[PDB]
Symmetry: D2
């Protein structure tokens, strides 16, 4: 009876990932999940953040979004991670959050949860696919059940066709309707699969 | 009520993969699945084969193992791929079989199937991880549901702790007990997840 | 005062890789290298080739292009591999070629050659990056010196920004200038690096 | 001048430190001017405080200078070493990587040689994928990647990782076969770097 527990954990410096993660959170709500939308703790020093108005502005924009904790992943049945690409991997901020999950991992409390990932870069082929890859490889250490979107909808094709997960080319400009649709399909599908797995076991 | 349909598709030149895939097949039957154990079509030139008598012999050893076909994956609810490494990737033989799945893929007919992988190498760090990775990335294009073992049983730790999939150091000696138990756990786990998936979807 | 020996080894079904490889070959010549443009042997059955006009046409268009053999890599001081993506890996045809390199590898005669790679897919984010990655990982087994382009020109940006290697979105219509400039720089740069390494060796 | 070699390594409990010292000594033996550099510790002290070996190693490394972006600008050859965290590099290593954005955008990381090393508690527990993530990173800089491959018998004897040295961390001292693989990797990288620089002079 109880709704799928979905945790969307994103890092964003300049707002693309925050926009993407809200789209993911709404998709999950629309599809019947109980959602936690959670920001990855910022590690940068203020004097660095201060050099970028858009970074400082997004931090302000997300101020009422709670910070991700391990408890949130223990709670979750379905997990989505979203990070911007940093040299073809996830941000250090995201990896620092992951590096706090060792206790939960040691307890077996990350196993069997569904996992998918999203990303953004300033270049269309700028290491996005590898950023997604590295997040999935991590989830495998947890015994997670990975639910990438594939090409299971016409929307994937329409938005540049990334079967590994939603990836958005960041150019300051708001999200395109095709990217939004790619995110929606990814999340709805994951929620649907998670509901099925949970029903089969209970 | 109907058993999980498990297809175990493997390439083997000299017998390592054949032994691994037999162990997988036993594990699946023991876990209540209906199992197809299936060999990848040998695509190598007979002059190349004729310089390795163990390869010729293993071909004959597997004479009553049917050749894998797209039909088998269309049938399958749970899929296991097994290939030895060639320079950190799968064998060309395995990729040739993958490359015949285009029609099923176009028809949305590989989606929502479970998937894990296994591999071997003559070196312990010589592509026992990268080979599995490349097979998982391929399954993501299908919209498969990836069910790697992670560290979800003690036997994974005992056999070298490969969370991505069973991996065996190929030396001509019989399969170690710890490797066998890691294969069995992986396949059992995947059968059980598949069954829950199917149960909750009707 | 030997020109650098550059082998461009490419697989192409429908002509995109052939256009890319020709651009690579011209850039190599312009950089003062001695160039071989070499096609990967086609393994597809004729009745599969017979299903697609652009595939049949491309095979005929490439008729006078020599077929790649291991001795081409023994000859080369600088190697480029190009393959279209198949589910985020290289084609079986390219892997089949790679699998013929075991004797050369055993002899130690692949070591120390420079290596970079190129790819294509129908979708912008449809597995190109992973295809390149799998190709670089293979080259590492050889002790190749990997020379990917990174962002060392501002025409990487203009091409879509692929630091791992040129990657084109296959549309049937011809190659864009940005893609062509990306390829040219990648090859010119690799030839320059290779010439320095050889001069340094004597 | 001698090849400028920077060994940048993260270590919590000393395995990476031992690997990096072996690497630094190999670089010197090969005639390079060597910087042995630690990645800044970012873990909260209360986490470090839970583990004696982690506290002890931080003290053991106290006189190793912290890596900065300018060390990579200086360097002609770079080696990165991180233990695995779920098949990727440590957040500490990534945090250092993330400070290289300025050098990257000015193109001041191009044409340097790069290889990587790693460790895990499990032999197949990310000893290949961690290396691969670090190599992908270096591609973004236009680095020239010089992994060991199977270019010496010692590679086979240490488990046959062609991507880079990888050690199974059991808390015991470094095995000799592992030391030898690290030495070969670094010696080979220095040699290639020297040829590249000589040829471009």
């Amino acid at each position: 009876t109880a709704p799928v527990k979905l945790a969307i954990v994103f890092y964003s410096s300049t707002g693309t990932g925050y926009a993407m993660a809200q789209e993911a959170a709404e998709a999950g709500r629309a599809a019947g999940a109980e959602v936690r939308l959670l920001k990855v703790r910022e590690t940068a020093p203020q004097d660095v953040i201060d050099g970028q108005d858009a970074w400082k502005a997004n931090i302000e924009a997300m101020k009422d979004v709670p910070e991700a904790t391990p408890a949130d992943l223990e709670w979750a049945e379905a997990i989505v991670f979203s990070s911007p690409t940093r040299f073809g991997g996830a941000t250090s901020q995201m990896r620092a959050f992951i590096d706090t999950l060792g206790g939960l991992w040691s307890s077996g409390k990350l196993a069997n949860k569904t996992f998918s990932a999203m990303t953004s870069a300033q270049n269309v082929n700028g290491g996005q696919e590898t950023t997604l890859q590295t997040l999935y490889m991590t989830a495998m250490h947890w015994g997670a059940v990975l639910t990438p979107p594939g090409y299971t909808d016409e929307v994937i094709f329409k938005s540049g066709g990334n079967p590994y997960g939603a990836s958005v080319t960041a150019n300051g400009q708001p999200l395109l309707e095709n990217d939004r649709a790619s995110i929606r399909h990814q999340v709805r599908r994951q929620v649907e699969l998670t509901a099925k797995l949970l029903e089969g076991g209970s």
